[model samples]
Target: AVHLKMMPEFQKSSVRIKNPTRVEEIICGLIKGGAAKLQIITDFDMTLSRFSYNGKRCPTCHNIIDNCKLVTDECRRKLLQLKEQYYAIEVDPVLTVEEKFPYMVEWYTKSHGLLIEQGIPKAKLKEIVADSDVMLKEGYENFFGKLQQHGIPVFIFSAGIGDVLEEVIRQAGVYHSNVKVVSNFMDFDENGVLKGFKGELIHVFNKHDGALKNTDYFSQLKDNSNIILLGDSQGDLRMADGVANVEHILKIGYLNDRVDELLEKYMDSYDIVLVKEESLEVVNSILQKTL
Candidate 1:
């Protein structure tokens, strides 16, 4: 029998699991497969990055660009207003997932269009990420470095800006060759000024669709059947939908906002739920056992 109570990280107050025995069994399968068959499919924004720092909420990939110096104050104000309007619809319990889908698309579209109007220079992304208040979660180095050292593929799938997300990881010095990022990439003109976004827009509600479109990527990793998925939103649960075959999958969720209302649903969907926790200790502990 697996002893979750004995595990230091699992003993913490923030960790919640609806079925501990099932989790133990899944974890055991992960350990038996080891690093060879393991791959990470994770969301970028609040999954890899910190949700809050020193009591203040951290910026998302889109927020990093929206709040950067390149954007005018007037533009920033409009963006914030857009966020306030759309984010409420995003989290409304009264709305079904189908109901929220189009709003998410609209939010992303308006935000991207506003960003392009700012004529943001592609060259400024690195500096924006560096000077901004963005931060990766605690234990990020071990979480990223260990995977890189073992040649494990860390697929960062985000609905946020791809360029900005890559810049964040690159600046952190953890954007290793083993890492792969798929997101809404910017379409810059010859002078490197933003024109528009390339491909289909990946909003918070359509990750399932995005995942299915990444079959070529998943097909290449066919032998890597074990998955460890990380995300902050319910949509993130679909991130591994493209994987051809899965022998084992352990879903870990971060419930950052509306804890009381979303707790039960998150607990039901994820193998482990970390509530109001800003660190990767629980995941790192599991990695220690698996790797």
Candidate 2:
């Protein structure tokens, strides 16, 4: 039903194509703008980083630090308690993501504050990442490689730890120059132990505020107007708000858990819904044609 003479690779599996006409228009807009006008904005945890690998759950950036030997088991227990209580408020279907924003902030602050009290040593991060279960999505080599090959900017704005997130991608062999990461990084004392976090805390839901704070990055790339944004939660929607001039953008959301309850909202928000998908294949599939 689209005006496309043929289906682009993006149409192959992007769930947006379920409604062909809308997808065709979005794709047409994408192609019309092409590579130079494009940029990528993505969430780090469970979006690019795998949720599970070989039937084992992958650790998020926070988890890498949280479960490290540097953090005491007691601190881990308290962190678990924080997650159990506040994470429910963060993801409750009854409350809108907007209404849940402040709670998400509180959750991060309290949890991270507890983490700082544990006196994490900066030098130990590399070992923590190496021993942890952080894994990039399958087909990530092509996904990150292609973007680098084209010199397209990848604005990775995450609510997770910046240092851990960088190390994860670095270990995966895809920490190319094109990747610019913005996230909460730990600030250590003279002894190289964490005292607090650098920059304003970026909670999952308040990425819009975080993006606006990165004006320098967006301002430099004003020529790049089209965006492809990826995430796992509704909070991921705000990841692109930092771009200065977004002409034609695509929102790809991966719905991995809480499917029965969150599916409709995911479908409504993300132009493409990858339900339970574990690879970066779809994104690369689109890029194969786009670049």
Candidate 3:
């Protein structure tokens, strides 16, 4: 009985879904459950953030640091080289997910090492993030504000730099108490110079393990059984694997690149796929109805 076409956001050219009836059924469940049973699990880099603006690609959390003025031109050149080498493998249709794992780890390791060599200070992150080209998806204010207002629990799981990710949101004035971010955090020396990363590596392919590791967070939210998960990668699908219970879960994916090759896979995996969509309007519409 849920009508998809009635909602203008869902009718956008960017929106695609393999099963409209199932989506409607799930959404009906979501609206029926309301805010009490709701929770959000999302990827940070390209899910909540814009992948491009005015036809120019935007920076990921890691890219923000690599592209900043604090880093030398030599270091930036090296970082770009790493990105060129690893990013292609990351999106390579010829390679299996398993085959791409080690490359991702290697890429992250080398990139982090290069960043450490730059002697970045923890204090400089705010200024760096402010000046960087990092942008949240359009309508982010409503997407974040409504959830915070409803006391909804938001789990932001990212493979990017934690300090920079937190700074991005905090500077945007939306880092609410209801949000929790788990990512590779920098461990700085007494002088606040980056020395290393804390905790286990959370590269893209290892999100299954990351999800299992956050069992404690999910257990605490056992009552929040309904979930809206958003991500830009296949690994992001595992983000909600730790949830103790799930009566209704909607997986929304943002397919920012390699559209022709990845579109079908995204549509098949995610309940809803947003193709080159730069805004959170579709998601915010759902929240407006449910909340």
Please report, in order, the local distance difference test score of every candidate based on alpha carbons: 0.92, 0.84, 0.94
The residue-by-residue lDDT of candidate 1 on 165-270, one tens digit each, is: 9999988999999999999999999999999999999988788898999887999999999999999999999999999999999999999988999999999999
lDDT (tens digit, per residue) of candidate 3 on 157-216: 999999999999999898999999999999999999999999999999889899999987
Best of the two (2, 3) by TM-score: 3
RMSD of each candidate?
Answer: 1.0, 2.4, 1.0
Model 1 lDDT at residue 58: 96
Better of 2 and 3 by lDDT: 3
Predicted structure 3, TM vs. truth: 0.98
Residue pairs in candidate 1 whose N, alpha carbon or C atoms collide under 3 angstroms: none
Q: What's the best-to-worst order under lDDT?
A: 3, 1, 2
The per-candidate count of clashes, in order, stands at 0, 0, 0
Tens digits of per-residue lDDT, candidate 2, 8-92, equal 5343443433354675677667767778888899998999988888888888899988888888999999999999999889767
List runs of model 2 lying over 4 Å from the truth: 1-18
